[PDB]
Amino acid sequence: MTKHIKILVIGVGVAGPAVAYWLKRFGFSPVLIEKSAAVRKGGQALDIRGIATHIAKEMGIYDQICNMRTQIKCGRYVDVKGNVLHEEQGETFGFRQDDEVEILRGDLVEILMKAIADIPCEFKQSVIKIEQNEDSVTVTYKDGRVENYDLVIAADGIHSATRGMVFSKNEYQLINLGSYVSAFTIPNYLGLDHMELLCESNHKLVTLQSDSQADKAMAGFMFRSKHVLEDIRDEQEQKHFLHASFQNFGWETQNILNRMPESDDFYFDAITQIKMKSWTKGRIALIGDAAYCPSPLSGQGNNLAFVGAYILAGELKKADGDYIQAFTRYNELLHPFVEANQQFGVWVSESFLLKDDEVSKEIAEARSNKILAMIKSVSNSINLPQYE
Ligand SMILES: Cc1cc2nc3c(=O)[nH]c(=O)nc-3n(C[C@H](O)[C@H](O)[C@H](O)COP(=O)(O)OP(=O)(O)OC[C@H]3O[C@@H](n4cnc5c(N)ncnc54)[C@H](O)[C@@H]3O)c2cc1C
Numbered sequence: 001m002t003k004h005i006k007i008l009v010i011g012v013g014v015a016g017p018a019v020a021y022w023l024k025r026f027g028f029s030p031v032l033i034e035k036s037a038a039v040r041k042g043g044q045a046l047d048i049r050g051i052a053t054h055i056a057k058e059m060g061i062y063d064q065i066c067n068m069r070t071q072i073k074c075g076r077y078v079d080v081k082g083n084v085l086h087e088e089q090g091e092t093f094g095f096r097q098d099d100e101v102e103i104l105r106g107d108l109v110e111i112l113m114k115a116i117a118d119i120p121c122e123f124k125q126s127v128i129k130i131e132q133n134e135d136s137v138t139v140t141y142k143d144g145r146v147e148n149y150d151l152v153i154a155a156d157g158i159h160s161a162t163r164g165m166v167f168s169k170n171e172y173q174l175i176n177l178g179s180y181v182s183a184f185t186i187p188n189y190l191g192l193d194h195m196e197l198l199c200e201s202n203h204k205l206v207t208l209q210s211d212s213q214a215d216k217a218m219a220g221f222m223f224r225s226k227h228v229l230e231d232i233r234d235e236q237e238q239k240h241f242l243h244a245s246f247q248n249f250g251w252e253t254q255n256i257l258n259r260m261p262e263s264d265d266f267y268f269d270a271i272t273q274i275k276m277k278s279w280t281k282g283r284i285a286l287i288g289d290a291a292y293c294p295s296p297l298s299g300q301g302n303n304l305a306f307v308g309a310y311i312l313a314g315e316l317k318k319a320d321g322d323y324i325q326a327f328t329r330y331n332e333l334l335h336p337f338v339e340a341n342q343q344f345g346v347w348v349s350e351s352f353l354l355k356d357d358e359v360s361k362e363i364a365e366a367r368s369n370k371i372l373a374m375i376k377s378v379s380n381s382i383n384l385p386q387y388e
Helices: 015-025 051-058 062-067 105-115 161-166 235-245 253-258 301-318 323-351 361-379
Strands: 006-010 029-033 045-048 074-078 084-089 101-104 127-132 137-141 146-149 151-154 173-187 195-200 204-210 216-224 267-275 284-286
Touching (some): 006 146, 015 029, 015 105, 015 301, 045 301, 084 361, 173 235, 235 267
Parallel strands (some): 006 029, 006 151, 151 284
Antiparallel strands (some): 045 101, 074 084, 127 137, 137 146, 173 216, 173 267
């Protein structure tokens, strides 16, 4: 029976635990593995907007998410001289409304994992090889141990090892949106109180906020650049490049960058999207960022993870475990919605910053209202199936 179908879920993030939840609810018996030793606390703030709120509520975790929601009360667009150009309430500032909510990744994963306390999960575990045939998927773990599964669903992030193991370069694209993003935590030296500041130029943007940790502040950087690092993963090159890229930005960048060396959670990466004609091959399926990362410029990453988890789990249910039918339905039903949200991400990367003009209240206000309207449109641009 479906209960006895062996399903491996790789990755304890959003999509992995989410699909595990729905698989378990729909009468399957998934297992989780995780390369990290444990769920990393805090981290990047994630939006739950559009369809994802409905799914979150059905999962019975919505109130828990709200209890752990970010609490920015005020967001401000400021010029390099510190003057306020445009101010908005926190949710509106984050282009959210209605029942939509923002939460730090670590807080959400913790809630997700509590919702699946029954499902087996193994941390500090990694797959080093995958081979499949018509009957089974043979998984080789780090220590050389082998296990066979009926299905493997990989939710191991944008830099998916599984994607590289299973798919060829002709079967997926790494779409570069021509910009870099960086972030790190520093002492709240300005003494911000549940407030975010945002300064921008023609090709660059800098944010600074404090929220749940009163004596800490999260710095953010975004900028367009055709420059390519000799080693994009070299953290020292990343910092030199970031410092050099913003050396004439003004405002608080000097004060932020002076504190960058002592920050312990430094992050830097190109803004990228994953585009695949098919997220599946045989008995293996990709989900979440591994399959269709819309990049942070979209604000849809979480939304796509939840919807994907629901649909893939659902189609497997209706197919009574028949993965060939389910994976086809998974690809067909979800691609337009994914492509819609990715294109919104592409649009943001091309048009958010003003290439020729300086920003003002009217621009920031008009741009904000437009993004709020457009994001609401795309995030709800799917008629979700009802598998129950
Ligand atoms: C700076 C930044 C800002 C963002 N802002 C937003 C936003 O405002 N709104 C929004 O909706 N989205 C945002 N995102 C995107 C969002 O974080 C992700 O889309 C979302 O977390 C999807 O989660 P996932 O489970 O698909 O992937 P992840 O959450 O990345 O899952 C990866 C997990 O898999 C594990 N893993 C990795 N490799 C392996 C392996 N080989 N074997 C086993 N396990 C492995 C890792 O330990 C990790 O726990 C942002 C991302 C970044 C980087």
